[PDB]
């Protein structure tokens, strides 16, 4: 389960194709889901009505599939832009942006290829062991305030 959205995209696309394929078995009101069966049983005056029902159903199914694909392609484009930005500003350089390159202070990143995706190995510096100290905003030496 480490690879999340990357496998989620594959699952969504496969499910969309499966639904599109399964839509070919529906009647949409026609006497039979098989266009060859409708053609071999009816004269053109009624075969036209049955085929019109089937055409309407299948065309609307295709339109639904294409609209879903466009909406998902927009999301994938946004994610690809995010990946390009991360590559440029995290692998090709050092990022000062907080949590843009993993939790902590970013040191460097290494790109790795993944199926229909990219995997980043963000190396970050994380402070570990603390101690309490008494601090002071400034220090007097000869009446003059010294700042670090």
């Amino acid at each position: 389960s480490a690879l999340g959205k990357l496998q989620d995209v594959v699952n969504q696309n496969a499910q969309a194709l499966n639904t599109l394929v399964k839509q070919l078995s529906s009647n949409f009101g026609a006497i039979s889901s098989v266009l060859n069966d409708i053609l071999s049983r009816l004269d053109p005056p009624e075969a036209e009505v049955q085929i019109d029902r089937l055409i309407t159903g299948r065309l609307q199914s295709l339109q639904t599939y294409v609209t879903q694909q466009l909406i998902r392609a927009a999301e994938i484009r946004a994610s690809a832009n995010l990946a390009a930005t991360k590559m440029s500003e995290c692998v090709l350089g050092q990022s000062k942006r907080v949590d843009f390159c993993g939790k902590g202070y970013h040191l460097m990143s290494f790109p790795q290829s993944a199926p229909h995706g990219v995997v980043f190995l963000h190396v970050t510096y994380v402070p570990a062991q603390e101690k309490n100290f008494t601090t002071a905003p400034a220090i007097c030496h000869d009446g003059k305030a010294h700042f670090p």
Partner: protein, 384 residues
């Protein structure tokens, strides 16, 4: 869940599978208690019918109309209904009924129908294209035939009282030219005070209970309660935004009843993976624990999960801060999700904490970059 997912293995989580719906207990039929019988006798057994140019229009109101005897009677050559089915006339009932009685030649019967045109459907009798009713015709060659020259032919429902007026001769030796006694029953189905209703006995009304009601032909299912909505004396039905009926007036007792749909809601099944256990917890969304180890949450009624005071990280989200999990003997538990351990910061105006050490951490971030480049031949898909 297994049937809904079209799979024999169910992953851990919460799935919406079916819909809970309260069922009615008994049916309520309510009509005005008028014992009068509609005078179809004086319309269908009349001695003489009028001509097609001046057909008589009889008003039928404030009576019970028994259409079953008319339907079963074998004297009728044709009985075509266009607005309503003949077998539904006993349940459905109408505000007013119009019976147009006149005599038509044998070949012109087909012209008495909505959407029809010709020398009869357009000149001496026109029916609306949205006509709701029935056309009844039977042969009268043994009552009207002679030569019988008292019958003459010349906007919808218009009575138009080298002449454009012509007559035919009725003789017994003339089928397609023999006299036909054709009567058109016209009904209006506007929601209004009903005066003509069929021979169906009314029943007593039950309030505060999910029932299958029937008010003057307006059918539905819901719970009937007394309401404080001031119907005006001419008002019979109330409506909601979605055009569905919201309130009704009882035709027998002049009181207003509020109609509320019987309780319903989605059913969610909270289960760990079938690889782990076959025990499930069921959530009835947005319903009370009345109509359904019962836990009441703002997301609905949760049954099968034991409420636990201890809070943990969310495992299977439910809603409104409640999460469920499979925990120890093991069973499904319900709890409020924990946002994390509380950590008070020892703040003061002259204390600073500085790390004396560090650790190098490598994290992993996965980002989609592309998806499958599918292409569908639309012509082959639709019309292979």
């Amino acid at each position: 869940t297994k049937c809904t997912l079209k799979s024999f293995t169910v992953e851990k989580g919460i799935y919406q599978t079916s819909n809970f719906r309260v069922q009615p207990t008994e049916s309520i039929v309510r009509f005005p208690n008028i014992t009068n019988l509609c005078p179809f006798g004086e319309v269908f057994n009349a001695t003489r019918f009028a001509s097609v140019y001046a057909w008589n229009r009889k008003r039928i109101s404030n009576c019970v109309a028994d259409y079953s005897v008319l339907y079963n009677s074998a004297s009728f050559s044709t009985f075509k209904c266009y607005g309503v089915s003949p077998t539904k006339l006993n349940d459905l009932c109408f505000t007013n009924v119009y019976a147009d009685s006149f005599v038509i030649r044998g070949d012109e019967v087909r012209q008495i129908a909505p959407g029809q045109t010709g020398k009869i459907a357009d000149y001496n009798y026109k029916l609306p294209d949205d006509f709701t009713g029935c056309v009844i015709a039977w042969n009268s060659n043994n009552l009207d035939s002679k030569g019988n020259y008292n019958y003459l032919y010349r906007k919808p429902f218009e009575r138009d009282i080298y002449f454009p007026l012509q007559s035919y001769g009725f003789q017994p030796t003339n089928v397609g030219y023999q006299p036909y006694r054709v009567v058109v029953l016209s009904f209006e189905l506007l929601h209004a005070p009903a005066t003509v209703c069929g021979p169906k006995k009314s029943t007593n009304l039950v309030k505060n209970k999910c029932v299958n009601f029937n008010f003057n032909g307006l059918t539905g299912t819901g719970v009937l309660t007394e309401s404080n909505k001031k119907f005006l004396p001419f008002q019979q039905f109330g409506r909601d935004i979605a055009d569905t009926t919201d309130a009704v007036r009882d035709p027998q007792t002049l009181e207003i009843l509020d109609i509320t749909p019987c309780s319903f809601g989605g059913v969610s099944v909270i289960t760990p993976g079938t690889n782990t256990s076959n025990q499930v917890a069921v959530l009835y969304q947005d319903v009370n624990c009345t109509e359904v180890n019962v836990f009441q949450t703002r997301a609905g009624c949760l049954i099968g999960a034991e409420h636990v005071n201890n809070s943990y990280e969310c495992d299977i989200p439910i809603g409104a801060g409640i999460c469920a999990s499979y925990q120890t003997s093991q069973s499904i538990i319900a709890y409020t999700m924990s946002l994390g351990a509380e950590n008070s910061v020892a703040y003061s105006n002259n204390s600073i904490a500085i790390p004396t050490n560090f650790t190098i951490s490598v994290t992993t971030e996965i980002l989609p970059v592309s998806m499958t480049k599918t292409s569908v031949d639309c012509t082959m898909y639709i019309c292979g």
